[PDB]
Design a protein around this ligand. Sequence first.
Ligand SMILES: [Fe+3]
Ligand SMILES: [Fe+3]
Ligand SMILES: [Fe+3]
Ligand SMILES: [K+]
Ligand SMILES: [K+]
Ligand SMILES: [K+]
Ligand SMILES: [K+]
Ligand SMILES: [K+]
Ligand SMILES: [K+]
Ligand SMILES: [Mg+2]
Ligand SMILES: [Mg+2]
Ligand SMILES: [Mg+2]
Ligand SMILES: [Mg+2]
Ligand SMILES: [Mg+2]
Ligand SMILES: [Mg+2]
Ligand SMILES: [Mg+2]
Ligand SMILES: [Mg+2]
Ligand SMILES: [Mg+2]
Lengths: 174, 174, 174, 174, 174, 174
Amino acid sequence: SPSQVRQNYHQDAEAAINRQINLELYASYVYLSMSCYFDRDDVALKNFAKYFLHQSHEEREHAEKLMKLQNQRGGRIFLQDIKKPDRDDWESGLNAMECALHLEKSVNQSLLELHKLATDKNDPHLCDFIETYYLSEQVKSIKELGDHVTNLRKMGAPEAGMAEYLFDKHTLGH
Amino acid sequence: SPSQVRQNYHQDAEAAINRQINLELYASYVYLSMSCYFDRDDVALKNFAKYFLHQSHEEREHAEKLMKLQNQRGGRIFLQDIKKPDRDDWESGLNAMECALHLEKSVNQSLLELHKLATDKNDPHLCDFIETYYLSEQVKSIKELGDHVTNLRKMGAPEAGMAEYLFDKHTLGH
Amino acid sequence: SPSQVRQNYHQDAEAAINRQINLELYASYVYLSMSCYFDRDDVALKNFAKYFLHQSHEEREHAEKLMKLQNQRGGRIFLQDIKKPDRDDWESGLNAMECALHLEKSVNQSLLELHKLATDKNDPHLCDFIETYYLSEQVKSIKELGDHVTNLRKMGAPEAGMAEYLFDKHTLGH
Amino acid sequence: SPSQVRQNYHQDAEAAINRQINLELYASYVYLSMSCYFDRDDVALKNFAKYFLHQSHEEREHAEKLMKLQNQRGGRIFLQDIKKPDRDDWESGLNAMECALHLEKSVNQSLLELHKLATDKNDPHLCDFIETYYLSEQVKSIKELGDHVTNLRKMGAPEAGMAEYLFDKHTLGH
Amino acid sequence: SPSQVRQNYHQDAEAAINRQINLELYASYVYLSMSCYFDRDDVALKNFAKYFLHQSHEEREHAEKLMKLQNQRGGRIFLQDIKKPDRDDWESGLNAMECALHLEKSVNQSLLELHKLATDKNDPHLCDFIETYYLSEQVKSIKELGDHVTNLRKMGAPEAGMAEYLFDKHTLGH
Amino acid sequence: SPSQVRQNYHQDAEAAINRQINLELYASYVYLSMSCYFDRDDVALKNFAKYFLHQSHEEREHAEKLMKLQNQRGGRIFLQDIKKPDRDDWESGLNAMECALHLEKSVNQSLLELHKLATDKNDPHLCDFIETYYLSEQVKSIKELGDHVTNLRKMGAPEAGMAEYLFDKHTLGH
Ligand SMILES: [Fe+3]
Ligand SMILES: [Fe+3]
Ligand SMILES: [Fe+3]
Ligand SMILES: [K+]
Ligand SMILES: [K+]
Ligand SMILES: [K+]
Ligand SMILES: [K+]
Ligand SMILES: [K+]
Ligand SMILES: [K+]
Ligand SMILES: [Mg+2]
Ligand SMILES: [Mg+2]
Ligand SMILES: [Mg+2]
Ligand SMILES: [Mg+2]
Ligand SMILES: [Mg+2]
Ligand SMILES: [Mg+2]
Ligand SMILES: [Mg+2]
Ligand SMILES: [Mg+2]
Ligand SMILES: [Mg+2]
């Protein structure tokens, strides 16, 4: 008994969209963990915390947009557990940026697999949705994170004590 | 003797674009018929008539955009008869919404076949045009019509006399 | 079983109004064909295309006003096929203007026959509607088209290459 | 090795705050599931979906405020899995409101246990935080949900088809 | 040793992007040559010169956007010589427009080959970038140039002395 | 067959102006290469990239002003290949600034030779043009680049990791 709006929407695509929803929610949760780490009194990097809180909210928005797509196409959303992040302690601004880069590249790889599936199922609307709202955003975010990692490494983080402080002020405070 | 601007524009794509122009014009004409049905003194649902008149004008705009694409790519527009709609009497707001949903899904299926043809002919500009201006609009319209059908059915239309009146006021009057 | 609003509205007038609706829709379609002809890369007269697109939209508005009259008087709208225009290629700005003049005079003749019928059936409201909204507009349009034809002919169109270019800039660009 | 800011902050309170963070995140996730249910084409109650999306965002904000408290007091945030909601299909607006009322009363009971623990540990700052930011908000939300449930039941939901439609327009659309 | 941001970016695509950068820079240089030709005291067509200077700056912007893409994806930009244009003397406004049309169609063919390569390498981000920022712009520019060529030819350029003067005033001066 | 506007404009000066046009275009291309180097994810100095992009655009403007002079005096512009820059990798902000200083001093030496030629040919208009639009600008740019080199060296660039980061923020970010 398919939805009255469903058209050219393969069941495999519906399942993959549900998986991507869970992945975006997990990414939001990871970014939230990082943000709270930098709010610690013994870390105390306010702009790192703000940066990762903003990333967390953006990932949640991505998840919600995918749910809207799922309903728009007549798919049915099936939520799963949002697993806790791998770490409680992210150990430095540089390490958190590197972990964020790894996470964003994993999310991008998932979106590329999703696009490959949509191409295989001849779903141009789903392909276009992924390209328009996800792929370019992912490439921009990956480039920005790589830039941050490069600058933190060059400045001497985490060993150079002033590196993360000044990067927090100059790059993330503006 | 091809057009001086023609490049990577297959004759099959040109023909399919002409067919799609006729289909959009036909859809506009169907929506016009519906709008006039709800303007009848014995139907008298002003916001249904306004909704379908707006849909008719939008379909005409879609047709004109396709003609602009045809000229932009060096194709030649060949117009055909615009067939009269299948019905003169659309019998209820719920029935007209259901017929509109059927029509929009048929138009979407035609656009998906058109996109498949453009992909087969390796015409990325035509593919991108269809995705950007037609596919997402079609999915949005299909979802909106499905929502209207669901609400009208739940409210008890057409048997429940106040259903279409109140839906006209609350959903289509805002 | 006549409409509850029907009064002094002869069946012959209702049928003639339906025929006039089809004629106005056909005129709109002819003007659309002309507009698209002047959008061709090998014709490329933007203001001719704009002029005829505006005429097409005006004719559609005339058709819709007639449908509103049909419902207002308790008549029932019966749509027919909108026949494709006689030509795909309109061959020049002067030729398109001459064809438009011929079309507008045919539409005017139909409206005059309609007014004669309304007078014969003693339908003063229908007579007044035709006079107020259609007859003066038709005479103005016929005079404007005749003026355009005269100017294009005097300038040397279509043989004089700059004639249609300069007429497009000066008369239709302002 | 306690935090340099830690003062009068019992380990039991820290653990209970972590549990409350997980509960608020779970509540946000439940509300998100409800919001997406009402976005379905076969449910199509836009203002119910908006109401529950707003509730989801508010619960996330509550979770984040608790994390800020945890860091402010020198506690350490330990995140856990966010369990998926008990249902995918919430079956009606009335049922979703009743489930939301049950959820909010469970969250309130958890906050009351948390306040009892803070009183037992003589932590007036934590007590005041719970009272100021959580208890009154919970009582207001519980009262609002009870009001919605009462009105939906009186209107005849879900059996009365127009009940949830009109409640969506009048109570949740303003 | 790939870039830390590189993902799903084939070496062939990187090389093709470098080639496209050189092609856009070359196109900018050709347009600059044309602009300077129309600034000559013995040609003296100011709006032709302005048109081609604007085209030159636009092509440079296209090149810079491609370089930004190359860095964003982790590719490495390798610049090559920018070859001088084929002509110093462009001989007339009509001839320059025809040469510009030929150049733009060659650039479009290169972008279509680039899109084919990206499709073959399953690089949806690169495909979408080409479609979004290059393909539609190319089709629009080709259509505009074809229109200019048609109008100049019809007006009698270059033999008709007033043709290019009046086209410079009316089409390129507005 | 000299130009109708040509007066007191030696052929040697015309040739030297053509050479200077090529040199300015080459300088613009070198600055573009530098700008793109600092946009790399593994360099990631945004304000260095902005500084050199601005320099590239300024050099292009200088080239265009020279072409305007060439036409104004009745000379004929003859474009040549724009050679690729000597390096793809500029290795550091300090090294790029030093290379830019070397380039600007070479351009200044060329302009001084050009002024010497114009003085020898008794061309006061060309002399005044070089003095007014080129010589003072060159001295200002050379002084600014020398200042940047001095500051980067004193700060410890490139060995001191924070040197180029902070110089990018403080000197080039304001
Ligand atoms: Fe500083
Ligand atoms: Fe009501
Ligand atoms: Fe004129
Ligand atoms: K730590
Ligand atoms: K009926
Ligand atoms: K023709
Ligand atoms: K249900
Ligand atoms: K010449
Ligand atoms: K390097
Ligand atoms: Mg995301
Ligand atoms: Mg696309
Ligand atoms: Mg349409
Ligand atoms: Mg008319
Ligand atoms: Mg709460
Ligand atoms: Mg108190
Ligand atoms: Mg270009
Ligand atoms: Mg210079
Ligand atoms: Mg002087």
